[PDB]
Design a protein around this nucleic acid. Structure first.
Lengths: 363, 7, 99, 50, 49
RNA sequence: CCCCCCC
RNA sequence: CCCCCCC
RNA sequence: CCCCCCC
């Protein structure tokens, strides 16, 4: 007599299926990774500055040094706990200081270089020697403030800021990620670029993208570093910049939900189309799923969690087309590559959005 | 004198 | 891997799912445990996507009935359809009960 | 039928992400700073006037 | 010291002033399309305390 | 990225 | 008996 | 399958 009992709620059921599991997945049982204890923080910060102020032949392990600084900031055992909670059985190998040899330092003791598992000593030694040679050449040419030295306390945060820029585009492609990182770091990291005029952003960004791809648990470690940095009472300008970029990375992989919220706020009349009305129930279910997951829903695609994909609006072609049309009408869409199912709805929504933006009204 | 730099 | 033979691997999987029914339960538990992990690879996200696409299998008529209601089909108002909607609501209530 | 379920609340989620952390950041592990005990208050006040 | 209080957030204070000034251009459709996130920022201020 | 006035 | 499409 | 813009 009434069609009120015809209701399914499949997305809630799929989320309940996925989340309510009594068995944990075990991955990377035989793999190992390296961390650095907080005591070596100084000895990593200095090295973190050596990648910046010299031209280096290779930048394979810059991202690993940034992650090492993250480990020093959080603590080695806390990093073990982070990696274990991420679903990985990776075993930490501990960073160790080793004497280089007969080489003597300015303090009179043996020159102690860092030993990081998975990073060959040749790369670290070459970085150290190249940075020292660049410093010697600069001193010979001209005779260097504190903020232009590798020992500056904020150099690891600058390296990690390049890392955070590449992190923001982890749901995009590697070429687009590198291009956006270079373009944004020319402006975002402009003061650091003036202090260190020969830090090679493209290769450091490439190293960070490689690290984020090979070691997925390092995404979780990076997110925990951002969370722990955002909860501190004080910090430097570099750390505030890092947390700003990190928060800019938040809703990555879910720009369609944000553009749908924008389209609703834009009062697009083509949302009233009967094709769109026929599908809005599942759209509301997706948004309700976001509310159910809560704050951690935004980090789903960044963490590369398999549960991501429940938030997809790809089974609402009318809603997606109207949302993309509204995005194009306001000029927001840019070079978004999201496919447009229905071209008629896209064009109509674009026309209405251009009409609304070009015109002005008072309420 | 490369390794004697202040750094 | 340009020489992985999809038809025979798929045939083997269908044979396994037919002979050993408990392996269906094992597969479902693997999907559930993979969907609950914090991180994962692109392959694992793909697996959970296909696994969730498998969800309502065998019950496409219920989904199409929900679609027909959302399509505002006027022929749902037919007296023959009205005479039977009570049991349809009972089936959907059973779905809600099972969860 | 209605656009009521389209709502995101991203800023609340970002604040909840930042504040609800079980790990503290450790900075300036090897640095030192100077303080003066209250007994020397007079001896600092005079210098503060100099 | 109390004059130093709201430093770095003068835009929030000027927004409160603009609301108290009854600026009619706040009723502009472009402004109306964004006031939800502005209210969210002010709610965040209330949350932090 | 953010910030930027006056008292 | 049930199931049966597409992604 | 999903994702894909800008800051």
């Amino acid at each position: 007599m009434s069609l009120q009992g015809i209701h399914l709620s499949d997305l809630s059921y799929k989320h309940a299926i996925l989340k309510e599991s009594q068995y944990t997945i075990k991955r990377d049982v035989g793999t190992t990774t390296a961390v650095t204890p907080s005591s070596l923080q100084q000895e990593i910060t200095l090295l973190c500055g050596e990648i910046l102020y010299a031209k280096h032949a290779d930048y394979k392990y810059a991202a690993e040094i940034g992650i090492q600084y993250i480990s020093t900031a959080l603590g080695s055992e806390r990093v073990q706990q982070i990696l274990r909670n991420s679903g990985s059985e990776v075993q930490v190998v501990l960073t160790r200081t080793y004497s280089l040899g007969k080489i003597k330092n300015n303090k009179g003791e043996d020159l102690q270089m860092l030993d990081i598992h998975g990073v060959e000593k040749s790369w670290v030694e070459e970085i150290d020697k190249e940075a020292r040679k660049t410093m010697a050449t600069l001193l010979k040419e001209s005779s260097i403030p504190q903020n232009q030295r590798p020992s500056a306390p904020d150099t690891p945060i600058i390296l990690l800021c390049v890392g955070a820029l590449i992190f923001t585009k982890l749901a995009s492609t590697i070429e687009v990620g590198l291009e956006t990182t270079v373009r944004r770091a020319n402006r975002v990291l402009s003061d650091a670029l003036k202090r260190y005029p020969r830090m090679d952003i493209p290769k450091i960004a490439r190293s960070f993208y490689d690290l984020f791809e090979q070691k997925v648990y390092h995404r979780s470690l990076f997110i925990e570093y951002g969370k722990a940095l955002g909860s501190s009472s004080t910090g430097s300008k570099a750390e505030s910049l890092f947390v700003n970029i990190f928060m800019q990375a938040y809703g990555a992989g879910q720009t369609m939900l944000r553009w749908g919220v924008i389209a609703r706020s834009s009062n697009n009349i083509m949302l009233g189309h009967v094709s769109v009305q026929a599908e809005l129930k599942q759209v509301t279910e997706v948004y309700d799923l976001v509310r159910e997951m809560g704050p951690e829903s935004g980090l789903l695609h960044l963490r590369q969690s398999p549960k991501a994909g429940l938030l997809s609006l790809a089974n609402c072609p009318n809603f997606a087309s109207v949302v993309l049309g509204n995005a194009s009408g306001l000029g927001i869409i840019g070079m978004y590559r999201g496919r447009v199912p229905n071209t008629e709805l896209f064009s109509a929504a674009e026309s209405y959005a251009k009409s609304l933006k070009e015109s002005n009204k008072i309420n | 004198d490369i390794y004697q730099l202040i750094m």
